Amino acid sequence: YLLLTPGPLTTSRTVKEAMLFDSCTWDDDYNIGVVEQIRQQLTALATASEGYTSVLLQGSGSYAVEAVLGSALGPQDKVLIVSNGAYGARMVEMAGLMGIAHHAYDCGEVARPDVQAIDAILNADPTISHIAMVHSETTTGMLNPIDEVGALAHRYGKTYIVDAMSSFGGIPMDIAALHIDYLISSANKCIQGVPGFAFVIAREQKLAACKGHSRSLSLDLYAQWRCMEDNHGKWRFTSPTHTVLAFAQALKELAKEGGVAARHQRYQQNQRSLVAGMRALGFNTLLDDELHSPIITAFYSPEDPQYRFSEFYRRLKEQGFVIYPGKVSQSDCFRIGNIGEVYAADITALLTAIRTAMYWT
């Protein structure tokens, strides 16, 4: 099965083979030989500038998002949270649960954030000390203007947090130039590794002032970072070593492909071809080509009264392709990712399977 999902996805066989080893968490072979190498490569991958550092955290991407919210903000801080999808909404949900001061700016799932509106909010409330926004809303496949909001964060001197879970590694970006202080991302999406942990690449000057902020020991990003910094990459608690080995290999394959610039080109091409082919088959995209993220695409569900995603999905799977359900509140859609082990030939084979699975036609 080819997983046309937003991740966990179809990893390369070499990435999987790298998991076939048992590592000792106290040994330098692992901490220096693997962990420190991953940290250094992540920072370099995020920016050419100095002053940044990486921290890895056990769990899913949401854990890292929660860790940043509870670690990057002090008891007198307040974060402006842009919400235009499930992941933006989850940050608002986390803030409310954790009792973190905030202001939610919701603009709809199919609406690009209004930068001027964000500018006004920041102007009317200087109490806002942080700005948080999702870069790639995997929910609808939309891409938010992290650059413009970043310029806004720099103008007002705010700490900028970006959830780049489904974009880092697949879309060119230099977080320093974007004025991003905390870049959050996944091990199993654009980088193409397997699930197990997430990471945050942060402006050291900012992170270094977060001691005591977290009320969670497990999710204390500062303590986690300090331990890696003082003990050659060592993780405070048990780390998913096998998945970490897989990540090191995924990073190497990313470098081999030609870096983010090359991977981005492949993803864009895959999508361009997929979309053209789907439209040729009568499907319609939820969003206009301008708002598209290059890792996934949302399509309106067929209007035929006989169409059922459950059946469409099963028939595609029977042919070896696994698509994804759509979770857009205002519209009935389904999604098709194009990252991971997906190349030109795969898109073509996918389209043939789609035509074949269109049982309602």
Added chain:
Amino acid sequence: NYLLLTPGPLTTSRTVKEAMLFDSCTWDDDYNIGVVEQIRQQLTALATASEGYTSVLLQGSGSYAVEAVLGSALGPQDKVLIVSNGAYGARMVEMAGLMGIAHHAYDCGEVARPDVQAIDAILNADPTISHIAMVHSETTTGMLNPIDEVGALAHRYGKTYIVDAMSSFGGIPMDIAALHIDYLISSANKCIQGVPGFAFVIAREQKLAACKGHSRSLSLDLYAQWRCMEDNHGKWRFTSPTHTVLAFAQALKELAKEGGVAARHQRYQQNQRSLVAGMRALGFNTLLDDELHSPIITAFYSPEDPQYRFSEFYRRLKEQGFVIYPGKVSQSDCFRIGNIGEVYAADITALLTAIRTAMYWT
């Protein structure tokens, strides 16, 4: 060529690792029902033969699960008695402090078995206590605590009982219902011999059922995590370490093939006893007396020879194919040697030979 004589991550079978060589779709039944539900069902049966219990899996290390229990199993007016006789008992106190959770810490030291009478007295004088938490196998020193007696105490006083069995579950027989344990926390990469990536809690449903809204953490909300698995056929709220989950399923299959906990336990304590005897024959002394030993890991006093360095001892052993572990005892310089994972009788023999060879200060 390395054998990991550590508390975990440890040396797993080749088959447990090869079971990871598959990608899973987190939204498909093949994974959620075909693997997750299977695991949940097996974990509950492994912990007890009675009804009323359920399993919840959580992404992260074992400490995440411990924290999830502390933040999800307790209500607003609740208070937990935390017995501490090692780093893992101490971590629960540390967590309770950070989270602002009312608690009563009972610290009896890292080399002393907790006093059950003392715990009784505490329960008598501090009626606000509603929960009791204790580590079963204290990996800090290899100490094995009396979870049975404390459970009887908890039952007598009608208190909710939490047990951190991270390094015991799967390697030491136990029926949680009979031990009066309401929340059993354990690891996927220790006695069950799986791979790190997630941890789990086997709890009495009736107790967990009343924890809605307790957690201030979305990621660590045990109740929510459970309701999702319960309502959507093992589905994890957020992305799960699928590969490590497939490995755990294989680990469970191999546990059964060995003969279950009874058989694994037999292997483990025999390894441990042979190790202690051999090490003592080589001039080493155990930190604890036999009576307090657990069958999973043992702490030895570091030799006094001025030239001795754990770094060198460790490297020369590793060079021979054996990786041991450092000791972190507050009032004593020790080193540890675990005997779990893919460790068998012949391995202990080989290790002892390696030790002699590595004793460069003699």
